Every structure is written in C-alpha cells, then in structure tokens.
Amino acid sequence: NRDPASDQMKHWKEQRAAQKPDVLTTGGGNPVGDKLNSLTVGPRGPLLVQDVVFTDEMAHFDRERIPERVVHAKGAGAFGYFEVTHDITRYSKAKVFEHIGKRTPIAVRFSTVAGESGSADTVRDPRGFAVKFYTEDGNWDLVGNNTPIFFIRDALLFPSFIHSQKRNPQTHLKDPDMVWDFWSLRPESLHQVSFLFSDRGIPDGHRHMNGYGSHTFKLVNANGEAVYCKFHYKTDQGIKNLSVEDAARLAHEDPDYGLRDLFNAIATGNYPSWTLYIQVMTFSEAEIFPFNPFDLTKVWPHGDYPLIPVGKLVLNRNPVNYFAEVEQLAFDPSNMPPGIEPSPDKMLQGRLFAYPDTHRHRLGPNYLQIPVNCPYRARVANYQRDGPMCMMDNQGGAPNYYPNSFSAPEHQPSALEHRTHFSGDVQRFNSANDDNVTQVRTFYLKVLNEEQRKRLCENIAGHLKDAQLFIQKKAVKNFSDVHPEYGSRIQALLDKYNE
Amino acid sequence: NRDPASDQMKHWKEQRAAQKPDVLTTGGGNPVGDKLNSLTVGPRGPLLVQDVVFTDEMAHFDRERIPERVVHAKGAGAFGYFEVTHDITRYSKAKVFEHIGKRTPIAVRFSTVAGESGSADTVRDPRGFAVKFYTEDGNWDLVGNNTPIFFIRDALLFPSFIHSQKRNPQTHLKDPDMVWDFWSLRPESLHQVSFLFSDRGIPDGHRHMNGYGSHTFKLVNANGEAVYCKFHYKTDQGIKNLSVEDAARLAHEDPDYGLRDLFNAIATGNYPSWTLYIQVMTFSEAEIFPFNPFDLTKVWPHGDYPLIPVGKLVLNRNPVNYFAEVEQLAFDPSNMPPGIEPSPDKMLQGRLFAYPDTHRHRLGPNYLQIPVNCPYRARVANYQRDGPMCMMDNQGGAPNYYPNSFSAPEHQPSALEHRTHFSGDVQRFNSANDDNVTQVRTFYLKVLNEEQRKRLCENIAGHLKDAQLFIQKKAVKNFSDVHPEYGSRIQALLDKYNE
Amino acid sequence: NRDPASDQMKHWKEQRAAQKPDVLTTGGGNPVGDKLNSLTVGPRGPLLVQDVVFTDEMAHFDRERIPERVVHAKGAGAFGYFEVTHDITRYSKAKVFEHIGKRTPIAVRFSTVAGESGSADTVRDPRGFAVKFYTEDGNWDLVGNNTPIFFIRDALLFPSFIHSQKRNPQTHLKDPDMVWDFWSLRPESLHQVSFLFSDRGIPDGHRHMNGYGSHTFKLVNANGEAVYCKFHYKTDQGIKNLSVEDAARLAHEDPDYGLRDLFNAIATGNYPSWTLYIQVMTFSEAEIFPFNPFDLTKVWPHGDYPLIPVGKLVLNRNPVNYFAEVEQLAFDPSNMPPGIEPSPDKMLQGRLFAYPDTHRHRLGPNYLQIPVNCPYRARVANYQRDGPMCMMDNQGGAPNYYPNSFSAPEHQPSALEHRTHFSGDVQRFNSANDDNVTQVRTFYLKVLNEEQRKRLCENIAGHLKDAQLFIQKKAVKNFSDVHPEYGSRIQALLDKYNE
Amino acid sequence: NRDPASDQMKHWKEQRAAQKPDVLTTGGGNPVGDKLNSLTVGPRGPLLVQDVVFTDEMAHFDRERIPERVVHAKGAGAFGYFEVTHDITRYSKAKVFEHIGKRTPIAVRFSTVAGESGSADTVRDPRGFAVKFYTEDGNWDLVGNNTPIFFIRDALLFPSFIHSQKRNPQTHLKDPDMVWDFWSLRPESLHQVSFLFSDRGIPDGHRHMNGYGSHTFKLVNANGEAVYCKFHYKTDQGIKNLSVEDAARLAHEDPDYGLRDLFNAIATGNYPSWTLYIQVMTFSEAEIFPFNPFDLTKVWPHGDYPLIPVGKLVLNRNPVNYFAEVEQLAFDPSNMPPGIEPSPDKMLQGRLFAYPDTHRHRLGPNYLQIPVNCPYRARVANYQRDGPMCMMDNQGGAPNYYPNSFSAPEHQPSALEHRTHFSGDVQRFNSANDDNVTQVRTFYLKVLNEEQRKRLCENIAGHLKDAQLFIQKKAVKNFSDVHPEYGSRIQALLDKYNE
Numbered sequence A, B, C, D: 001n002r003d004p005a006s007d008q009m010k011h012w013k014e015q016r017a018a019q020k021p022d023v024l025t026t027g028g029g030n031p032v033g034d035k036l037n038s039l040t041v042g043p044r045g046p047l048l049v050q051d052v053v054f055t056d057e058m059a060h061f062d063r064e065r066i067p068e069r070v071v072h073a074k075g076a077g078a079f080g081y082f083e084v085t086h087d088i089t090r091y092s093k094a095k096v097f098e099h100i101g102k103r104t105p106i107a108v109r110f111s112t113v114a115g116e117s118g119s120a121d122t123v124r125d126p127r128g129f130a131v132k133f134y135t136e137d138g139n140w141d142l143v144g145n146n147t148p149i150f151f152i153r154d155a156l157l158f159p160s161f162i163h164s165q166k167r168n169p170q171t172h173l174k175d176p177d178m179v180w181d182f183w184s185l186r187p188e189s190l191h192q193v194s195f196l197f198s199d200r201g202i203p204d205g206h207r208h209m210n211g212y213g214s215h216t217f218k219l220v221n222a223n224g225e226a227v228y229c230k231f232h233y234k235t236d237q238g239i240k241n242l243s244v245e246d247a248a249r250l251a252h253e254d255p256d257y258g259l260r261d262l263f264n265a266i267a268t269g270n271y272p273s274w275t276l277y278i279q280v281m282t283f284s285e286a287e288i289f290p291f292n293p294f295d296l297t298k299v300w301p302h303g304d305y306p307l308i309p310v311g312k313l314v315l316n317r318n319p320v321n322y323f324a325e326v327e328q329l330a331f332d333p334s335n336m337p338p339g340i341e342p343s344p345d346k347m348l349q350g351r352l353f354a355y356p357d358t359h360r361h362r363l364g365p366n367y368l369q370i371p372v373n374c375p376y377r378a379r380v381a382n383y384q385r386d387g388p389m390c391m392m393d394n395q396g397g398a399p400n401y402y403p404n405s406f407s408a409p410e411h412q413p414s415a416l417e418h419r420t421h422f423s424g425d426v427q428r429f430n431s432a433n434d435d436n437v438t439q440v441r442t443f444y445l446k447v448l449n450e451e452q453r454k455r456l457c458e459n460i461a462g463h464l465k466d467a468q469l470f471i472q473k474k475a476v477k478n479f480s481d482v483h484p485e486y487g488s489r490i491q492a493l494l495d496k497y498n499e
C-alpha cells in the first residue's frame, strides 16, 4: 500500500464497485459504438469525415489548455471554512465577522511566483496564499502572500519586476543580470529581498508557513467609523523550513512536493489550520506614523501595534477535479463586502484593476459564472447582460436598464463607501526614496541571530555571483547601506566566488 | 390597449407586483449604493478607478456583442414540441419516432438569408426554418429552409454564392452584377431562382410557409435496413404571401414584421403548427432514379414518391430572453441520433463540418454547455475535458482516457453506422452539367398558372435590369434553355427597362 | 451607363486589362487544381477529409464576421487630409496646428446611433462624425457627432440610454415605452431631444451636416498655459435635410443612401469638405459661466464665445476594402497628442475608458496594429510585449522593462500633462437638477421660426403617441417646463392621435 | 566573462552603443512623461482613471500569455536552411527537391512531449523535431520526432495516451498506474516503449539525436507516378546520450539544459546539421510487405530498403524574440506542396485535421498571418476573407467568390492529387492485434548488446515498480511475449523493488 494520493483511481474504482460503468457518448450525448478504431475505407484505407466520433473528441482535446496565470502559475488548492472566535464588530460591520461561532466556506490557492506550470515546488520564491470567503454580502477575496511585504511600492514597476524575474526574451532562460540589475537599481527591494533569501525563502510545504495580507486595508463599522488594518493568518502547524541541500534534492525527486503534501495531509484527516489576526491603526495614528503607513515595503511593529485575534482558517477538503476547481479559481482583491475597504496603497490600487482584467482574458468575460468562482451564497442581481458563454437564464426577461419604473433591482444605501478627504496636486509623486533601510537594519540585527545572518549572506552570494561585477558592486553598496557588516559578508564571499 | 408585444414590460411588472424589487449588485454580488452618479473628487472633478461600480458595468457593456451569424443573421425564435401521429418504425428506429403520442421538446429559429441583424423581415430571400429535437439519444438538428432545393450542389461553391448575395467588398452595397454574374455562370441555380422570384419569395410571416429538409437523408430501422428519405413539414395555417407592393411598405413601416407576428401569435394563443411528412426511396429505387437522387437542385416528384405523414410540430412558447435563448441557438446537422444518418449529398457532406466549426468561433469552444444548446434529456459522458468557460463539474474526477481499467464510459455497439459499399476513383467529379432545366420546365408549365408566370418574369426583370447587358444576355439565355417563352418574356421586359 | 458605385467591378477589371489573372492558392500559398468540385469517392460518393481545399476555405468563411459596434454600427467611411488655415498656436502647441498650411492625413467614419449593420440610412437619429488625425505625436481621434450636445451628462446613464434606444430584451422590437419612459424620467434630455425632432434629425446624407466635439476640451500651449475649447467643423456644402415623407420612401428604396451619396461624390471629384472652428473659454471665464461649463447638455452661446477658424477637413479618397478600412476603424477619445487634454466632463471622463475597453473586445488586444488604426505617422516604442496576433517585430529583442541601464525607450518630459487644482469631498454628486430648460427655451423661441416649431411638435407627437398615457403626460410636462405653448402643441396633437 | 547566452543583454547594449535610446510611448505612440510613479491625488492619495499610461501597460501585461501547446509545450528553436545534395526528382516533383544545390529556408523546433512550459529538458521522453520548409509552392511542415515509430497506430487512442502520460485529473500528479494501465492494455506500445527506456531515451541535447518523419508518406514525380517513402534526418554530430545519474542532476541544475546548448552552439559558430535521407517502397512492394506498411509501430528494415540521401539540414541562426519566433511557431502536417502526399496511415490522417484545429484555438483564426508561420516565399491568393485580427490588405478589392468573370485567382490543374483505387466496407477495422512483438524481438536481440539489454530492463523496472501489482504482472506478460528473458529480467528486478 502507498500514500493516498497514489491510490486515487484505486479508491475511485472502489467507491463505484457496485454500479455499472456509464455509457460512452459524444459531447452531444450520442452513444458511440467503438472508440478504439477509426472509420476507414477498408482495413488499410483513408479516414472519413463521417467519423464525427474522432472529430468530436480530437476537437476538444485540441482545446483543453487555457493561458496559465501570468504570475503564480504553479498552484495547489484545498477547500474548507473560516470560523469567528473573537469579537471585532467594533471595527468592522462585515457579515463574515458578525458573531463568534459563525462559519464561512473558503477556498485557498497556494502557489510559487516565477515558475511555470511544470516547475518544481521546492525553490526559493515567495508563496501565494490566497483565500476566497463566500459570504452573504458577496465574495471576499484575501489574496495574500507568505510575506507581510513586497519588493516594490508602486504598481507601474510591477510588469518590470516580473519580467526581470522570468525568462530572458531572446534566450528564454533565467537571467541573474535581469534579476539583480533591477533589484540593485531599486533598493526598495532591500526589505523583501532579505526575507526571501533567509530560511523562510523555502518553506516545507504549504502547511508550515504564514500568510499575510501585506497591504494596509480599511475596516468600517456600523456607525460609519473607520480604521486601518493588517491581516495575519499564522500557521498552527508551526514555521518549518527546508535546507538548500534538501530543497535541491526534492526539486528533482518530487517536483510536486507541496501539492502532494497538502493532499495527503487532508486525506488522512490531518487538517491544517491558521489563526487570523489583525493589527489596527487609527486615522490619527496614521498621521504620525514615522513611515508611510501604506508603503508596501513596511510593516507595523508589534510592540506598538499588537496582534488582535479574529478566528481560524481550516482546510479539510481536497478538490475533486484539479482543473475545474483549482485551475479556474479567480481571486479579485476588489471583491470586498461592506465593512472592508481599500487603503490608498499605491500597489493595492493597481490590483483593483489588474485581477478582473486578467481574469476576463484567462478564463472568459463571464468567469464569475464558473462554479468555484460563483458568489453562491449571495443573490447576484443587476443590469449586466450577455457575453460569450452565458450560463444562467441571463437574469430572465427582467428590465435591463436603470433607473426604471418596473421594479428591477435597487441600490442599497447602507453599502456606500466611507468618505475620506484628500487634497493635493494631481501629479506623479516620487516614492523611490522612502526610508529603504531602517526596518531592514532592525531585521538583520534584532530578529536574526549569528547563524541566520551567516546563512542569509551565503544564500545571497550564491545567486548574486552570476551577475556582472558592476551589478554585484551596486547591490553590495545597497546592502552596505543597511549595515556595513551586511555588505562586507556578501562582498567577502563574492571575492571568493569570482575565483 | 396595444398588441401583447408592446405591453411586455407592463406585464413583467404586474406579474411581479406582489414582491419587493431586488437589490442591485455588482456582478460579484456586492450591493450598489448609488448607480446614477460617478465617484469623483469634487462636484466638478475627475473620475477615480476606485469607482469599480462604473467599471464593472461598463466593462460588461463593452462586451455585450458577439459575432452575428455569417448567414441567416436576422431571426425569430419560439419553442414547443413535436408529437408523433403515424408509425414509421419500419424505416427509422430513432427514439423520437418510437410510438404514437410521443412528444419531444423542440426549439425553432426562423431567418432570412442575406440580411444582417438590422435588415427588414419582408424582403425577397429564402427563409431558414431550423428545428432542434431534444431526444434521449441526444439532440437532433433538422436545419431546413422554406424550399426543398438550393441554388448549388457542391459545397465548394457555397462561400462564393454567399459573397455574391452580400455586399460589394469595396462599396459595401448590394451589387446586382455580383448576384447575376454568379447565377448566369452557374445555371444549376435556375430551379431555386424560379422558386425565389415567385410569390412565395415573400411569405406573409413565418407561420404561413412550409419547411423542408431539402437534403436526402438516410433512415435505419432496428433490423439494420436503410432507406433514403426527404423531410417536408407543411404549414397548418396555409400558404400566404405578401405582394411586392405591401412587402415594400412594411419593410420601412415595420422591419420586424415576422418577429412581431410570431410573438403575438403564440401570446394570443394562436399556436402555429406544421405537419411533418417524409418521402421514402429504396436503395434500389436510388440506382434507377433518372437524375442524381443526392443532387440538391432536384426534388422527388410526388406522383412517384408520395408523402407519408409522421407527426406535428407545434410552437406554444415565447422566449423569455431573446439573446440567451435565440441568438445563442446553434443547430448542427451533424447532431444525428441513431436511426437517422446522412446521404452522400455533396452539399450535406460540407455542412457536417461547417456548422460545428462556426459555432466554436461564434459562440465558443463549449457552446454545447449553453442551456438551449444543451442535450438536457440525454446523459453526456465521455473523455472530453476543459476548454474556455467550462461550466459543469467537467465530468469530475472520472478517468479521462479510453480504454481504461477503471470503468469510465463504454461504447454502445448498437449505435454503429449503417455500412454502405462505394467504389470509384478518389477524384473531383464535375457536377455542373447534371440536368439543369427539366424540373424547372415542369415547374414553369405545370405548377404555375398564366398569372403567376407573368409575375415571375416581372420580379426577375425588375432586379436583373440593373446588371450590365452582357450579364443580362447570358441569364436570359439560361432561361430560354428552360423555355423559349420564359426567356423571351424576361427579354421583352428588359428591352423596356433599358429605355 | 450607371453611377460609379455600381460600376465598381467593371472598373477593377478595366484597371487590370493589361495583366493576367493571379493563381488560386490556399491560405497557405498552395495552388489549387479545381475549386468548383469536391474530392469524393466516385461521382456520387462521400466527402473526404483530405479535401483540404474545401476545409481551408469553408473554415475561413465560417470566421468572416466579428462583433458589430455596440453603438453606431451602421457606417460609411472616407479618407483625406486636414489643412491648417489660421494660427491658434497661442492656445495649443499640438503639432497638428504647428503652422498654416500644415496638412495631416485623416480618416472619417459616418454613422447612425441605434440601428444595426443592416438598417436604413435615412432615419431619425443622431449622426456620428468621427475624425482620426495621424500626427507626428501619435494619433488624434476627435470622436464627434452632428450635434453640439447629448441627451445625458453622466456616463453611468449611458448603458441605460442605449438600452432604451434599442430593442426590447424579450420581443427584440423597438419599444416606444422604453424610449420615453427614459427621456421623461430624465428631463436633461430635453435639449438634445428638441434638436433630434427638428429638421436636422434627418440629414440629406453625410455631406450636408455639421460636426462637433460636443465636449469641452483643454488646449495647452508651449508656455504651459491652458484654456478650454469646443470644436465645430461646419459643412462647406451647406446644411440640407430630408422631410419625413422622403426619408421614409428612401428607407426602403435605398437602405444605403448615405453610403452611396458619399462614394459617388468622391468618385466624381466632388470632394466634400468641412471648416474647423474652435470656441475658447479661459479658466476665469470658466468660474463665472452661468451653467456648468463641462455639462454635455449645454452649449457656449456664440455671442459670448465666437467661432475661431482653424482649418479644413477634406475627403478625397474612397476605401478600397470596406471591411479592412472602415469596419475595423477604431477611434479612441483618449488618443490625444500633447497640446490637447480632456476637461473634467463627466461624460468624456467615461469615454476615456470605454473605447479602448470595447476595442480590445470587438477587434482584439492588438487592434492598434491593424493598418488603418496604426499611428503610422509616428514611431511606436515602449515596454508592451506579446498579446494575441502580434504582427511586427514585437519590438525585437529590446529590453522589455523600465527603468533600465540598457538604452531602451525614455520618457519625454515636455509631454507631461497640465496641472489643475481640485478640492472637495470625494463623493457621488447629483447632477440631475442642473438647469434643464433655459437653453432649450432659447432654441424653441429664438432659433426656430413659426413653421419649424410646428413640425417639431408634429415629429414628437408622431412617435410619442405610441407610448402609454402616463408616460405621455409626464413627457408633455417636461415640455411645458420649457414653454407652455411647447407642451400645449404636443398635447393637442396627442389628443388627436389617441382617437 | 561567461557563455554567450548569459551575455545577451550585454551584447544588445554593445550593438547599440552608437545610437541614442528611443522615446518611451504608450501603445498608441504617445510619449510618456513618467513611468515610475502613478497619478494620484496627493502623495498618499488614491489612483486615478486618468492614468492611462498605467492602464495601457497593465492591460497588456494582463494579456501576455497564450495557451501553451497541448503536447510538446516545452521547446527550443532555431533557423537555417535545407540544401539538396542529391537528385531524387525521379520520385518527387516538389520544388524543394528541384536541383542539386538548391536552398530553402527552414525553421526547427525541438521539444519534449509531456512536461508543461516549466518542466526540465533532461527527462526520459520522446523528443519533437519539427521542420518547416518555406517553399515557393507553399510551406512544407515535416513534423517528425526523434523516433521512427510511436506507441499507438490509431488516432482515436491519442487523447487517451496523452491523458495517461500527463497529470491525474484530481491530484494533478503524474500517475504511474495511469501510464502502465494504458501501456499494458495496449501492447502495440511494446515497440516504442523499448526505444524509450533504452539509452536514447535521454539525448545529450537536441544536437545529438536523429529526426524521423515516422509516417509513410507519398511522393509523386512529374509523370504522375507515385511511391511511398520514409524521411530520416540523422545528426551529423553523432549520437550521444545522458546517463540516468547525470540527467537527474542536470534536471535541477539546469532545467533548460537543451535550450542553453542549442543557443550556445549556434552563437559560437558551431552550427548543428542533419543529413536528410529517404527510404522508398513501390506500390507493389507495399502489397507484399509482411506487416502493414502504414502501421506507425513498424519500421522498414534497412537491408531491404536502404537509405537514399537527399540533402542537408543546417541551423545557423538563433531567434531574436523567443515568443514571436518559437512559441508562436505552427506546424501543420497538412501543409504539403505538390509532389508530396499522405499515405493512408490511420495516425497521419488524424493529424491532417488536429493541427490546424488546435492552431486556431491556441494562436487564432488567422495564425498563418503571423510572420514566422507565413508562407513568405509563395504568393497567397484566394477567396478567404476577414477573421479576427486581419493584417494585410485582406486581399484588397478582389472578387471574393468563385467562379467569376472578373479575373480573380484561378486553379492550377497540374497540382491535383495522385489517384488511388480503394475498395472495401466503410467500417471501423480492428488493428489492435497486428503483429506487436516481431520487430521488438529483433531490436532486443540483434541491435542491443548485453550491457544495453541490462540497462533497458533496469530503466523499465525502476518506473514500473510504482504501479500496482496487477498492472505489473500484465506488463511483464507483454514483455515475455517479445522474449522470455525480457519479461523475466524485468520480473527479477521488480521482485526486489517490491522489497
């Protein structure tokens, strides 16, 4: 006997042992009489058009694939629920927090960032940790990473960062010059790069890592009062990492290591679960916060802003078909129910456009009609109609315009947004020089110990040594600008790596 | 008080007066708070991307249209049933014919041929009369017209024909030189053209014209014995035509005359209906048939092959949403249930491929998962997976390959095709010189009376006068080949029209 | 001999008489050996798959259509040039106005609003008068109508307005209840409805109407100083209109009357031309203007803001292929060169998004690479890469990220936008009760004479009579709010129309 | 300094040192003023819709991906030429073989089979070796593999096989049970499976492997006489393989090993080349041939049918943009110039439909208009019009219908297909028990030595051990049927692997 993942078909057959196999039909429901030999003239003659059995199957085979995700293509998925355990209704009116003991179905996707569909699981990368809540006020998508922070803090750079992290356009190979020529030209990546190359760059499967919302968000309660917030869901199975040595072995011994581990855990009743916390910053604490509280390369320190528990995330169910239920999942940060609102984070504002945009391409204009994407615990009612591959009654014969004197849906005034006052020139403000070193300096000195600083510098050198000298030189100076000894240790190792 | 169609909204409100109007949401279910004023910074300030409510709706407004049908774009639709009244189980084992009193749900779409989606309903043009039978053996599409014949008999001439009947590629105007340059060079059109320029060329709506499969099909019974057949469905409401003068007033008075007629008819209870007949020809009779029995420009005369009644087509239901239920209708002549099979009719062979092909472009790769197109009375199970906009469970975790030791669907041997023997060179055979005037001579002399012959030439002459003279000369010569009087009457009128 | 449009094929053949016809190939460049008969097994046999000639052509026939414009679908196109004749460089620095005599290639598309591709040209409807200027600084699309104003003044009402002007979602029929339930509920439409229902509702083709940009636009000069402006391009052929009687005869005698008129004119050297004016309003005059100076339902009176000539628009070239040059034409109001900027106009703000959004759907992601859409007077260079159907080098092996130390394209600082100061609450402001009657009162009394006021009410009553009584009452009341005698005349004619 | 691939960006800069950097625009050509900072209201304010620069780059970054290939997704590409070195004009009249010394431009793509876009190069799999000749008679796509044979010999089983070779639908894990449940039920895979688990299962890059057209094809000379042939192109660099122990290291040390090798060879002037041979079998030798001469699991032994050399394949140019020139590459076995024609091979026949079908889905309706797929050395001319993303003049104002009197393209009678006589019942013929072991017995005993048989059995058992026992026993039985020591060796190793 083997692990449960390997016995999938075995169990599938056992769970059907009594009933008879179904009839094999065409996509049109017509039974086929033989699907192992083609319609031909004589045993050694040519194929016929009449054989619509071959065409109908071959045609659909020819149309299996869709465009993989432009980032976070390698994914693992599982389903479960979220349960409220504490009371934060003084901050947010969101139904998903309405009372202790309330559950909501969730869907999760774990992913790497750079690799394509076929890439190994056990590499050095950040990890996608997206969560879809199916609430009654519509869906809520918390599309977070395993990091509170990110490498850049203005969306316009994002296509550039991702191009630098993916394949050279001519050679179609990973390029350390592209990787580091960007990172060293944009030292705002100092805070996140440090995180990446330390021990938690390679987590041991998806159950031994935290998730963060990273952005600052806005909560809104029943009085109309608003605060800013951070989301942290911390692993109840404990932070556990892989060594460089063991990550590289598994990278060829089991390219689907994290996928397997997740499925096997759920299958044997070993259910992973996370603890959702929030931080809270008042509007007037945001005015005096020493950094930009919406800077995505910054955290809120725990001494001044402690973690306030909210509930538990539990995954207890495996997908049944991976394509339908994991590959077609779409998470839109702009899916926010009343009570949860975006901050002015320059990076979050961009993701409000990008995700629904890319989802209309990747999946199809009516991608929200796909079951796993469908807000199936709310009533979708509005004045949008048509589009390719319409799948419900298309809202019936309801009046399709607004306003109207025929009682088609109405707006709900309690769901209006919180109103903030803003004043300033409409222009492009330079954010390349917000404090790029301070919170990193703290991380290097005060969070890491002696050994971890050693391994941090070795991991950086072990990937920066393939970049040209003028690129190495500038990166080292950036590291020097956090701590002299930081750059020194990397520069001592690069002197050796260069022979 | 007005005709029922004009009161559509009025009635949608009355049928609802007992409820409260719904809540107006986004596509993602989120309630809208204001959908008449945009989110801007100051009363006379600019628009924000934070206004996702605008973008959600506008993005779907921008994607409302799909490609119109490349032919038969202007159409009318309704639903009803087919009911068996006579026994033809000796010829066909199809379940749709199984016993007397058997009902089957049907969908119908009426259409013109050349006009695009905005054209007028009351114009000279054939009429499409497509019927879809939702049988337990899968769907059956009988895609027929209002005429038993077509203008051509090889599918390689079809795109040409359509282009000649549509707009000038540079001026975008209907071009008489294109219509008649083609018809005069291809005299095999003389038959259908004579039908087209007769009174029936302009039916008084869709309820007063007959339907025809036109093609020769094949019927297989339970013993494996096969006959050839034609399908006729005649109007129970009686043939009734518009005159050129009335047709031209309605064309601007009410461009949607045949849509309004079909709708108000069903709404006011006047259910239209048709009587389905078949002709039968034995394989032997096919070998001695003077003409080619698979030549789409020939009828089987009624003296030699009388009409055998089958059942009743009835339309008793109006669509609730036009787009969802009529514009997305896709009829595939290749959808054939066991007991019905195609003949070698060259024109039917080409339609076996073309319709599914254009449905994957017009509607999409999985258009069969659109409700009206779904074989919702059959159990569709096979090894076809994925594709854009996949909407069921994608057949779940079932094994997706055949053969397989895990009891996925199995082929049904009794659904194999009838075996016919063919012999000959694989080679493009010339069919342009099959008899092109005999059956047209009979029609002119023995079906039409004098008045009708008189009008036939005036309708022809009124359109052919716009073609250059050398085209005129050639078309007249084709008509003289049918009957010298037929040609010389046309020519007498052209002599006048040419001043 | 006939008119030039109908002799189009005759000339094509004449223009080629010297040379010999090309070889018939497949889409892959393979010569065919017969394209009139299909490859079959014997003369009466079935069709084969290895007839790739048939497949290659039919599959492309099957994909001829794309989506028609969601609005303004019926159109006619021509090309020519714009010539500067006066110096407005003190208001704008745009290269298209650089010096007197500077010409710029243009492309113009005329259209109606509500009809679909097959509808008639001579109907009551606004007209689209779009102009594309191919300047050195990129393309400038001036997407203008034949009115200075529009029915609404918020873009959130557009989908609704167009829904109410189009077909009933269940009967697919034009619905006078929708039309006037909307207009009566939204009286802001009083101004444009009064234009629509007067003589110029039906122009005598596209060579006898004026063009307008309707929206306020911003002009910026070389010093950085801004002003607000309107564009008027008046016809040098003279205003000329059709009567209700002649418009309706021509709606069935020549559905393509405006297209033929334009084509014939150009083909006979009678080139139509238009005179481009601007109005100018300073930022100070913008604060004291009696109404909102960005309200699309308002004009700037000539006495206070006179016309300032600019140049000529001239159409002297017919399209060679209508589909490739007129149906694939794409205008974007967001295509604006340095010198010309949008005003805060709530309607124009939304056209900034809607058009590129719809163009990616209707045509494709890279619709800007289609010839007629291409800024072929400019040099495109940036960091945008790939997409469906990429057709040039894709910009080669150039670095695809920014910033870079590898001499990829750079920004141009002198192309930065003008800076304006805005202040106020970010909220959705009500514009429903902007003065809806004052400028209409002036039109009714001071611009129309006794005869024209008569016909204006008659045209209104003819169409408003078909709507329910409660909608009539409301609409008349909106007309009495302009002038008692305005609502009176309409009510006396409706009294008659209701028997 | 480093290898040439890593210095791609360095060199691109050097090759431009003399010029100035371009100007960064939008896609419409409009210059940008800053592309590092987003347009916001105040330094810490929300993003605006007015920021079209952001939308135009993000909207295109959201649509970068296209569906990877359904098979052979991981690939490597170059360009070069084919040169005729011998005369085979007595067999084929094709213009690519016209005279000794004639050159044709070619395009090659190497590829694995099962892995997706991100998998490793150095795995056990067959290798694609597609070749596209740009002929004056239109493209010729010789789409070969690195083996003369395949696992199956009917196309209906192909989706199944592939499904069995890829990922479990539920676990998204490679499944050994699936692999060998298929392979053991279908022992016609014995032949190719023995090829795959031998040394040549893992070639040392794409330059040290042969290429085979595999299928039997037809040649036709100028007299209309025809023969059958096999295409073998053998590596001029010599066969070279990797050991299991080196392939697994490289699989995590350089997943793109073969991609880097190809580029580095060409970039350093070391151009790889192949020698094209053919075998020939007369129509009369095909009749007596002991096995089915169109069976894709069978080779033509060299003693009886010796290689005849034809020409050289040389690759001497790297792609400049990988996506445009390698990812968008499209081969069609159906692209065949006069002189070359398909054999009745059941597999090949299916491939005549599949490839254009999937290319329309993957790339788009007009994929042949992409530069790298264009037949840019023939003149394409026909009656196919329009489609999404229409790019040339759409063939201008030419008559779009056939036949016509206006001198639009004409068919070429010399380009008709060779005529073969076929006879038999139209039915589905069972080919599952054509000889499945003979040629495999010959390979095991006569081609492999002692060591190689040893490594063959070790390779097979190492992967079959993970399959259930009832699958093991069957597969072993299929191996005993080739040779008792074959299935007994494998059984000895499995006995140990099962502890």
Ligand SMILES: NC(=O)C1=CN([C@@H]2O[C@H](COP(=O)(O)OP(=O)(O)OC[C@H]3O[C@@H](n4cnc5c(N)ncnc54)[C@H](OP(=O)(O)O)[C@@H]3O)[C@@H](O)[C@H]2O)C=CC1
Residues within 6 Å of the ligand: D148, D195, D198, D199, D200, D210, D234, D239, D299, D300, D301, D302, D303, D438, D439, D440, D442, D443, D447
């Ligand atoms: N006739 C053919 O086209 C081929 C036959 N074979 C095998 O050879 C057997 C006998 O044919 P015959 O022509 O009389 O034999 P020959 O001795 O004439 O030729 C044997 C062929 O086998 C190839 N070969 C050698 N080792 C391997 C391996 N590990 N994997 C794959 N191919 C290999 C060689 O290709 P190379 O020239 O590259 O060394 C050679 O062309 C067949 O049963 C068949 O399995 C294999 C390939 C082609």
